[PDB]
Amino acid sequence: EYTLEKLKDLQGFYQKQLLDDTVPFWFPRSIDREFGGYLLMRDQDGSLIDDDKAVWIQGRAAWLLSTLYNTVEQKQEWLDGAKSGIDFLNRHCFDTDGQMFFHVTRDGQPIRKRRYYFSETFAVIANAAYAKASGDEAAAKQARYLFGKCIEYSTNPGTRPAKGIGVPMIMMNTAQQLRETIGDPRCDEWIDKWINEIETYFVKDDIRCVMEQVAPDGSIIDHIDGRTLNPGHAIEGAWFILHEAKYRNNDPRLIKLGCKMLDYMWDRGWDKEHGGILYFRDVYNKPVQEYWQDMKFWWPHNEVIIATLLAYTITGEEKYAQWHKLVHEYAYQHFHDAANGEWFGYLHKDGTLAQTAKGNLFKGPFHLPRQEWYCMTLLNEYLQQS
Amino acid sequence: EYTLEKLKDLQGFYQKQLLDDTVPFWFPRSIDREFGGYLLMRDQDGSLIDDDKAVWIQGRAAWLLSTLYNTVEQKQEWLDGAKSGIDFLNRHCFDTDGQMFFHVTRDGQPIRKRRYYFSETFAVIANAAYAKASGDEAAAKQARYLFGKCIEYSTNPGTRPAKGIGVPMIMMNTAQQLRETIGDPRCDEWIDKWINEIETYFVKDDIRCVMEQVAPDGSIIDHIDGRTLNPGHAIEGAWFILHEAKYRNNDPRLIKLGCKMLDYMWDRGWDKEHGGILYFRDVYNKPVQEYWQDMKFWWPHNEVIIATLLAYTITGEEKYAQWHKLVHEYAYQHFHDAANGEWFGYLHKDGTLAQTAKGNLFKGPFHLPRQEWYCMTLLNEYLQQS
Ligand SMILES: [Cl-]
Ligand SMILES: [Cl-]
Numbered sequence: 001e002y003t004l005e006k007l008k009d010l011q012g013f014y015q016k017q018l019l020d021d022t023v024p025f026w027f028p029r030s031i032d033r034e035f036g037g038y039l040l041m042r043d044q045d046g047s048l049i050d051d052d053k054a055v056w057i058q059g060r061a062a063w064l065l066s067t068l069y070n071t072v073e074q075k076q077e078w079l080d081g082a083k084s085g086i087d088f089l090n091r092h093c094f095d096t097d098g099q100m101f102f103h104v105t106r107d108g109q110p111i112r113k114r115r116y117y118f119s120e121t122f123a124v125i126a127n128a129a130y131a132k133a134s135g136d137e138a139a140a141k142q143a144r145y146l147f148g149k150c151i152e153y154s155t156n157p158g159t160r161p162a163k164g165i166g167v168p169m170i171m172m173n174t175a176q177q178l179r180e181t182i183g184d185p186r187c188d189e190w191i192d193k194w195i196n197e198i199e200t201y202f203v204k205d206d207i208r209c210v211m212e213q214v215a216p217d218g219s220i221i222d223h224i225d226g227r228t229l230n231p232g233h234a235i236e237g238a239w240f241i242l243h244e245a246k247y248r249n250n251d252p253r254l255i256k257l258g259c260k261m262l263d264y265m266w267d268r269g270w271d272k273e274h275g276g277i278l279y280f281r282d283v284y285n286k287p288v289q290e291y292w293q294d295m296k297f298w299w300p301h302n303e304v305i306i307a308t309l310l311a312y313t314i315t316g317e318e319k320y321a322q323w324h325k326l327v328h329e330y331a332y333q334h335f336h337d338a339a340n341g342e343w344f345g346y347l348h349k350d351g352t353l354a355q356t357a358k359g360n361l362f363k364g365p366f367h368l369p370r371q372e373w374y375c376m377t378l379l380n381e382y383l384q385q386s
Numbered sequence: 387e388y389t390l391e392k393l394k395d396l397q398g399f400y401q402k403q404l405l406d407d408t409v410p411f412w413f414p415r416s417i418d419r420e421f422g423g424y425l426l427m428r429d430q431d432g433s434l435i436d437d438d439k440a441v442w443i444q445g446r447a448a449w450l451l452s453t454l455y456n457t458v459e460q461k462q463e464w465l466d467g468a469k470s471g472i473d474f475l476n477r478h479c480f481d482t483d484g485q486m487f488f489h490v491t492r493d494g495q496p497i498r499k500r501r502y503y504f505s506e507t508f509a510v511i512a513n514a515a516y517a518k519a520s521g522d523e524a525a526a527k528q529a530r531y532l533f534g535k536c537i538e539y540s541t542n543p544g545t546r547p548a549k550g551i552g553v554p555m556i557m558m559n560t561a562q563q564l565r566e567t568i569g570d571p572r573c574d575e576w577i578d579k580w581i582n583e584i585e586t587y588f589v590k591d592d593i594r595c596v597m598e599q600v601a602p603d604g605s606i607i608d609h610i611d612g613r614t615l616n617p618g619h620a621i622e623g624a625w626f627i628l629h630e631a632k633y634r635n636n637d638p639r640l641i642k643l644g645c646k647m648l649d650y651m652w653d654r655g656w657d658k659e660h661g662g663i664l665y666f667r668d669v670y671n672k673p674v675q676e677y678w679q680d681m682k683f684w685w686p687h688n689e690v691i692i693a694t695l696l697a698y699t700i701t702g703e704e705k706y707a708q709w710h711k712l713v714h715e716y717a718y719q720h721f722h723d724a725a726n727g728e729w730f731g732y733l734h735k736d737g738t739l740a741q742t743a744k745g746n747l748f749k750g751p752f753h754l755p756r757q758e759w760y761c762m763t764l765l766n767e768y769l770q771q772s
Binding site: 295 | 427429435436438491495496497544545546609610672673674675677678679680681732734735736740741742743746747
């Protein structure tokens with residue numbers, strides 16, 4: 001399967017895709033010079049379908065620009081672009097009670113506020129990465145403050161109580177990004193707790209499944225919502241854990257855990273008729289009720305590309321190279337827009353395009369550039385060690 | 387052409403489908419003998435995929451059974467079934483603040499409560515129809531009490547205010563059902579206000595569109611949510627208005643209003659590539675972001691079948707017979723399950739089945755049986771006058 005020359009070609013592919021295709025689609029043109037932050041809700045040709053701003057994606061974009069500055073090239077325009085988002089978050093995206101908005105207008109007026117703290121987690125990683133890039137001590141302090149607030153909420157996130165895997169997952173990745181940028185003494189211990197929560201409550205070895213939600217004792221909630229799985233989301237967590245495994249000196253327990261989550265959810269998620277990762281499944285193969293259950297979204301593919309390549313480089317198991325080849329070829333052939341750049345977001349089960357937009361309230365410069373950046377970086381490291 | 391002969395055939399077809407196929411799929415087996423209410427979340431073969439109870443659908447089902455008893459046949463089984471749903475609503479489906487739940491367990495414990503009051507409107511029409519079928523004065527008083535509360539809610543309620551067409555539409559049909567069962571002196575004057583609201587704010591003659599939401603002054607909100615249209619929903623409102631026109635001795639002004647709404651949204655909503663009514667469209671033909679925008683759902687087809695047949699019997703315009711033939715043939719050929727009865731809910735754009743369930747949190751014994759019952763009784767009245 002994958003030779004070193006082939007992995008060298010893959011490294012260059014992800015690098016050139018990231019820097020010559022994906023990032024230029026968004027930046028610098030998406031930087032809103034008049035109001036700050038980013039205009040990211042763009043059609044296939046780059047034209048705007050909306051001038052609203054999703055607060056999560058403002059933070060994700062600021063994180064990406066800072067991360068490119070810190071790990072790829074110290075381009076002033078990326079630093080300036082990151083600062084524009086940080087400033088927009090601080091100036092407009094916090095309510096008087098200190099909680100962040102979810103959805104604001106171009107000029108920063110609030111449209112939606114969600115009880116969630118997920119906006120805050122993306123402000124943490126954005127401020128952490130920006131603090132590293134710029135030396136801004138205020139951004140460092142904000143990142144560490146909000147991290148604690150996020151921890152606080154995570155301990156305490158209605159006759160059918162359920163806990164969701166997304167809390168430990170997002171907190172783990174937030175803690176990882178905080179560690180890898182400016183550092184914080186809480187990161188490693190809490191990551192341990194969040195991994196233990198994922199393993200204990202959400203990974204079911206007897207049925208080879210990773211749950212999206214469970215009851216507080218870990219039991220499966222046998223109702224429509226509780227049965228609904230998201231393979232791409234579970235495999236996102238799997239590679240967060242494989243990432244942690246490497247940091248922890250290739251810890252065999254964490255390698256085993258990440259790999260089995262990936263194994264379980266590749267089997268449940270990969271569409272053997274049409275190819276690609278199904279968005280939702282049902283733990284007992286009852287019909288999934290969420291309407292988009294069999295659609296092919298971009299971001300599950302981004303996460304499975306990372307996970308399979310990461311699993312392959314860590315374990316050397318050829319099957320992960322075979323799965324990587326499958327999902328990589330599937331995703332780049334079906335989502336990538338060779339004419340205008342970047343990726344479509346939304347395909348039907350059979351791979352035909354459902355609509356042409358490349359950015360909206362949920363899609364922006366995050367999952368795809370993170371995958372291309374992470375894979376380019378991973379392979380550079382891997383090839384240096386070979 | 388739609389001859390009297392063809393319309394007689396259709397009349398018998400809808401009657402046979404309603405009584406030999408649609409209703410038997412649900413009743414009596416869906417009657418929850420232990421806890422009351424109805425077990426309606428069923429797979430294609432009738433097996434339960436969940437024992438939860440959607441409060442809207444408990445009221446809709448009680449309304450249907452009462453309506454059948456009143457207008458088709460005084461089956462004791464239907465009356466007893468209607469009372470089961472009424473009692474379940476009264477016993478379990480009101481919160482301590484007087485607002486109704488949206489989603490409860492089999493035994494009536496709350497799962498979810500929504501800010502809307504659509505639960506209440508379906509309790510109105512259920513109690514009204516049951517009050518007529520049984521002479522229960524408590525149900526009649528309840529229907530009128532809840533109706534008054536819905537009126538207050540509708541008149542006595544973010545930097546982007548929007549008003550939705552669903553409120554005046556649902557309130558209109560609620561009032562119509564109240565009028566046609568037990569009567570209420572407020573029905574006609576409030577229907578007039580709601581029709582005026584629909585015509586003034588949501589119907590756009592210049593661009594031939596019916597909006598889902600507009601700004602308080604009626605202007606189009608040129609953002610993703612504000613641009614999103616629902617042709618089936620607009621056409622549901624169209625036939626509510628055509629129904630009112632008939633009630634008002636074929637009021638030509640309401641005929642024109644209902645017909646232009648139908649004309650506008652047939653043109654925007656009918657899928658010329660694959661057939662069927664698309665779920666969402668965009669007023670300016672920008673890409674629609676809601677994931678299921680191009681799926682083919684059962685209930686838009688139910689409503690367009692009513693609207694086209696009603697428009698045809700009222701106006702005699704052959705185009706509405708042509709449109710009815712198209713949507714009738716499309717819907718019964720694609721959604722109807724000849725093997726087990728009733729209709730699948732969810733098809734892809736190209737008409738292929740997305741999943742097999744026939745009842746869930748949103749689909750149950752309502753839109754389809756209402757369409758078959760309404761078309762059967764409409765054609766019976768129409769052919770009695772020829
Ligand atoms: Cl994204
Ligand atoms: Cl329904």
